[PDB]
Ligand binder design. Structure first.
Ligand SMILES: C=C/C(C)=C\[C@@]1(C)SC(=O)C(C)=C1O
Ligand SMILES: C=C/C(C)=C\[C@@]1(C)SC(=O)C(C)=C1O
Ligand code: NA
Ligand code: NA
Lengths: 415, 415
């Protein structure tokens, strides 16, 4: 037979700490309580760029606690935004894990980024246009290189078993967790910090996705705009986030007295090869990513109690994912779409949702999918709504799909 | 025991086709003949930005055959540069492989990019500053997303078993081949297109690396400037490239009548966690990447006949790598530093050098390291020089290290 987590072919891998900053709270346990209480992080945008351009979209979720409120002058001048978010989250996670002293040579970092947080290249041109080539900083390269956020975290925490940055648009944060899991089960590492970071809401990304008709313009009722799987959905809403988790073999956790929050059992990565931005309507390759996570985990579809949907609230996106969940045989699972409350954070969002999937398993509860008022016949899923659903969730799949047709599914189990 | 290629724990993986565009030729076999003849791709830069800024560096290797000489109006307007290079190379590789019809569901793409080729973000701002948010294109997102080049190639060739983009600066093209190998040996794919692409030589990258004292300024004798491992080296020279290879299981190659060019036996990925730009002087983690490739391959250091060095010609870089090669027990291997002739192409260069390592094994010959005239006591390596060395090369390691401390070693064997 082929190796699986269930059959002992791969070592057992557990999640031992989590951290996230969101539009609801800088504290992940407070985000979680807020989600359960039906809170939304989506408000009217007060940024002057909205009025300057009279943007069609006037809603979104900025971080409750801005990263830079924690950043001094040196960091503001010598790191990109996503590097600063990485430093902040990396330090928070390590403290939450009990500041353990690990073997650097068995410790990896895998952190995805999304669509930019891309400010530092332009600033270098400007320096040079005015002052000449000797006015670019000898610090420019480390601030501009797209591996920069993972590099900062690796250097901060002392990771010598690989520092990787996968890029797959909206799935980058989940894909990072996937590669971290691989690095451990293949024997290259015993412990990994993994997840995703992303820049803040800015005018150009809004314009670019708005022009594709991908975004909600329900500006009158910001908290009601994001409606994944609802009949009356009209696109996604941006909500800022960054999220990291600590994963390690069960024996490594045991040896240092860390209590696991959940198990990371398997990961599946596939691709649509269909269209540069739109998902394949049939959901077949996305479904297969789910199936692959189950194969590696040693689970059957019948074992899956819960799916944390990618669920962006676009008309075609949600329809494609409903088909995918059917293809994977998981359409009896209880479904949550967190973007209903937290919005879409592109490179970070899969990581944030992996953390939420962990908390769902730990606590035996799924928050309500906000704004889910009218089921859609083409969807036909069991979507949690109204109030939290307490349940015996034993296994879950977190989905994260990205523009380009990148499909990542992570299988988690209760510990 | 742990699985290895030698012990049958991993399936046999072979390289069945190669393509590259370089400063010497658009045809990889002509590049190779040129290298053997002692040709350099490095010349005086004629770009007006050199004189505009009176840049300290006035040398480099532009592609012999520019990508865009093959590109029509639609591609020029609707793809980024690295996407156009990807499309070009992807089509060339597929034709070289005999245009095979493969199962899309077992076919992956992994393509790295480096430090930018970053033109398309600025062009979107400009459209919006003048014409407003409705003047950004609905095509902006697909041209700007950093997964774009791998996405184009995946869509072009029909890869449905994953489309991935690793970013690790100068090691990204080798790291791509590493992840492709993993995707196959873990059973997610049977065939993969893999490698790296990079943008052309531009003013800002030259200014940024020049200000770090990383670059040669021997402008009087462009072909003599790049001197890896030489006593009188004074930094790297940029030389443009893109390179892709086709890898597949040996049984998949056999079934379709493809003749392998070499075997890809193992890959090691580690990190220095030392400094944001400089390598660790001791070479220990870089050495360990080499050792890890050997472990996975099932080889000992004594088996390694040849090392295709990262060899950038910086004072501290070459010194660190000599230490790494010692740490890995590989200091009796015949060493080639191709950057001596082809210069440094950042995200693409590891892929190009993996192709060269394949040709060295196929043909039993290593080209001369150009400009190697005075051995350096701190290096103490067996560097091939003067004229090509014909030899019985059975196994080789290609090294590629990247700013951030990212170390990738790939182990190849003669077929
Ligand atoms: C493969 C998925 C593709 C191409 C597009 C998706 C579904 S992913 C995403 O985050 C959004 C907003 C979409 O519309
Ligand atoms: C880990 C390697 C680091 C940090 C720097 C290196 C050696 S990698 C590279 O391409 C160049 C020019 C360097 O100087
Ligand atoms: Na999800
Ligand atoms: Na090399």
């Amino acid at each position: 037979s082929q190796p699986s987590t269930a059959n002992g072919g791969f070592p057992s891998v557990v999640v031992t700490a989590v951290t996230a900053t969101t539009s609801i709270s800088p504290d992940i346990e407070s985000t979680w309580k807020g989600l359960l209480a039906g809170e939304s992080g989506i408000h009217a945008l007060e940024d002057e760029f909205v009025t300057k351009w009279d943007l069609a979209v006037k809603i979104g979720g900025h971080l409750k606690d801005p990263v830079d409120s924690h950043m001094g002058r040196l960091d503001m001048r010598r790191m990109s935004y996503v590097q600063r978010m990485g430093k902040l989250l990396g330090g928070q996670l390590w403290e939450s894990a009990g500041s353990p002293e690990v073997d650097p040579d068995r410790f990896a970092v895998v952190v995805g980024t999304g669509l930019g947080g891309a400010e530092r290249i332009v600033e270098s041109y400007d320096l040079m246009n005015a002052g000449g080539p000797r006015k670019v900083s000898p610090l420019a390269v480390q601030m501009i290189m797209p591996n920069g956020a993972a590099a900062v975290i690796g250097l901060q925490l002392g990771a010598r078993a690989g520092v990787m940055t996968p890029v797959s648009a909206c799935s980058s944060g989940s894909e990072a967790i996937a590669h971290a899991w691989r690095q451990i089960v293949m024997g290259d590492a015993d412990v990994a910090v993994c997840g995703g970071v992303e820049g803040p809401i800015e005018a150009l990304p809004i314009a670019a996705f708005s022009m594709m008709r991908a975004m909600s313009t329900r500006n009158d009722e910001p908290e009601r705009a994001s409606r994944p799987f609802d009949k009356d959905r009209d696109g996604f809403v941006f909500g800022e986030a960054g999220a990291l988790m600590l994963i390690e073999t069960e024996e490594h956790a045991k040896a240092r007295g860390a209590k696991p929050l959940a198990r990371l059992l398997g990961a599946g990565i596939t691709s649509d090869a269909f269209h540069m931005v739109a998902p394949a309507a049939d959901g077949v390759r996305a479904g297969r990513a789910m199936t692959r996570s189950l194969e590696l985990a040693g689970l059957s579809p019948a074992d899956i109690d819960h799916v944390n949907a990618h669920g962006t609230a676009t008309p075609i996106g949600d329809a494609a994912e409903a088909n995918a969940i059917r293809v994977a045989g998981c359409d009896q699972a209880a479904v949550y779409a967190p973007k209903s409350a937290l919005g879409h954070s592109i490179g970070a969002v899969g990581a944030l949702e992996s953390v939420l999937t962990v908390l769902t398993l730990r606590d035996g509860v799924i928050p309500p999918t906000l704004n889910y008022e009218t089921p859609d016949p083409e969807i036909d899923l069991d979507v949690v709504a109204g109030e939290p659903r307490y349940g015996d969730y034993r296994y879950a799949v977190n989905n994260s799909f990205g523009f380009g047709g990148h499909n990542v599914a992570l299988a988690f189990g209760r510990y």
